[PDB]
Write a protein that binds this ligand. Structure first.
Ligand SMILES: O[C@@H]1[C@@H](O)[C@@H](O[C@@H]2CO[C@@H](O)[C@H](O)[C@H]2O)OC[C@H]1O
Ligand SMILES: O[C@@H]1[C@@H](O)[C@H](O)OC[C@H]1O
Length: 302
């Protein structure tokens, strides 16, 4: 655990949290990891326990052991939680993707959203209702949901989510929204304006922010551009930067700090060895679960 909590320092600027991710393995693999989470972060996103493949492996049959643990740990330690993720084309059981009937897919889709959201109703700050539904060029991704249900699945998803748990912030998450003018950023903005104008309850836009070294400085403008979509809020949801330089991290932290709609940042992992991009050392803590230079730099910028 670092002595100075960046989550604390960020919140002091009026932000909601600066968090990270977790699940049974990482929260138990050693003493430092959970100690770091408790000491320096204020929000948690289940790394994999809440995805479709892990919550509904077989039609209408749920398995909540893993998610229950993540949620319970967070709730027990005063950490906000971001559910992730309800609708996505990846980490999706074959039984779902094989469905060809629209009404059948809608029934299933709603049942999944409901059963999962209901189980943690009132304990979830924000849900990534939809995840990565855009092609890089701004058009809608042709996932089973899009091919079978069509564009109406967006409305069906958010509206169901909104009714099941009106206390959660409904989000649409996506990566590569890292620079103003990027096709995906424009596609996200234009679609969201359309949807919001149609009455679809979209409370925020989630920007993963999985960056390469040197892409930090361009994040501020992307955030500004996303702000034009018109959602109540926005947030950096799955942050990690190859090289984890202090410059990239401070830039990204400032990108959020100086944008009124950015409620918080969630770093996709605690220490390097546990990173899904470990080979790039893209996290704030190293192999020894010790603060890297970037962590201290972020702290001193706040
Ligand atoms: O295998 C897991 C990965 O899928 C990853 O989780 C994913 C990373 O990519 C993002 O698009 C998704 O939003 C996120 O949930 O990180 C954990 C790995 O173990
Ligand atoms: O432990 C579970 C809890 O996490 C969930 O919120 O409500 C149902 C319980 O069984």
């Amino acid at each position: 655990q670092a002595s100075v909590s960046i989550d604390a320092k960020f919140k002091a600027h009026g932000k909601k949290y600066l968090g990270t991710i977790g699940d049974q393995y990482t929260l138990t693999k050693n003493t430092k990891n959970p100690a770091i989470i408790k000491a320096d972060f204020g929000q948690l996103t289940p790394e994999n326990s809440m995805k479709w493949d892990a919550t509904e492996p077989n039609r209408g049959q749920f398995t909540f052991s893993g998610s229950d643990y993540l949620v319970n740990f967070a709730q027990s330690n005063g950490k906000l939680i971001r559910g992730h993720t309800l609708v996505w084309h990846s980490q999706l059981p074959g039984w779902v993707s094989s469905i060809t009937d629209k009404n059948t897919l809608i029934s299933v889709l709603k049942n999944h959203i409901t059963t999962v959201m209901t189980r943690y109703k009132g304990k979830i700050y924000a849900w990534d209702v939809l995840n990565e539904i855009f092609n890089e060029d701004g058009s809608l991704r042709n996932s089973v949901f899009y091919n079978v249900i069509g564009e109406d699945y967006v409305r069906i998803a958010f509206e169901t989510a909104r009714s099941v748990d009106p206390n959660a912030k409904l989000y649409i998450n996506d990566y590569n929204l890292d620079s103003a003018g990027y096709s995906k950023v424009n596609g996200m903005v234009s679609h969201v304006k359309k949807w919001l104008a149609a009455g679809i309850p979209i409370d925020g836009i989630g920007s993963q922010t999985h960056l390469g070294a040197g892409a930090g400085s361009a994040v501020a403008g992307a955030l500004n551009a996303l702000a034009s979509a018109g959602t109540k809020e926005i947030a950096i949801t799955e942050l990690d930067i190859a090289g984890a330089s202090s410059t990239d991290y401070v830039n990204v932290v400032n990108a959020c700090l100086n944008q009124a709609k950015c409620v918080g940042i969630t770093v996709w992992g605690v220490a390097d060895p546990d990173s899904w991009r470990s080979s790039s050392s893209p996290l704030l803590f190293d192999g020894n679960y010790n603060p890297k230079a970037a962590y201290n730099a972020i702290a001193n910028a706040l």
